[PDB]
Ligand binder design. Structure first.
Ligand SMILES: *[C@@H]1O[C@H](CO)[C@@H](O)[C@H](O)[C@H]1NC(C)=O
Ligand SMILES: *[C@@H]1O[C@H](CO)[C@@H](O)[C@H](O)[C@H]1NC(C)=O
Lengths: 31, 36
């Protein structure tokens, strides 16, 4: 699954993304 | 691991829960029922 972490659009429009139990070397800054 | 089936981890680790029980246990050995 892919999850999106947001502080709320009434605070900011930045976003972070969690790729669930995926090794972070095969996803396709801060990794 | 499988086909469309996954297992999500719990939010509190086992280390955190053992920390919680040692705080309860040190509160009761030392203050009785006053800390609750
Ligand atoms: C939501 O927006 C309103 C007005 O734009 C503001 O008063 C309120 O503090 C905002 N809420 C948060 C959690 O920032
Ligand atoms: C992801 O793959 C690399 C390459 O084998 C490995 O070193 C790494 O440990 C893997 N990720 C995890 C969380 O083990």
């Amino acid at each position: 699954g892919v999850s999106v972490i947001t502080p709320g659009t009434n605070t900011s429009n930045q976003v972070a993304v969690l790729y669930q139990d995926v090794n972070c070397t095969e996803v396709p800054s801060n990794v | 691991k499988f086909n469309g089936l996954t297992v999500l981890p719990p939010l509190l680790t086992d280390e955190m829960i053992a920390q919680y029980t040692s705080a309860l246990l040190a509160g009761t050995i030392t203050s009785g029922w006053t800390f609750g």
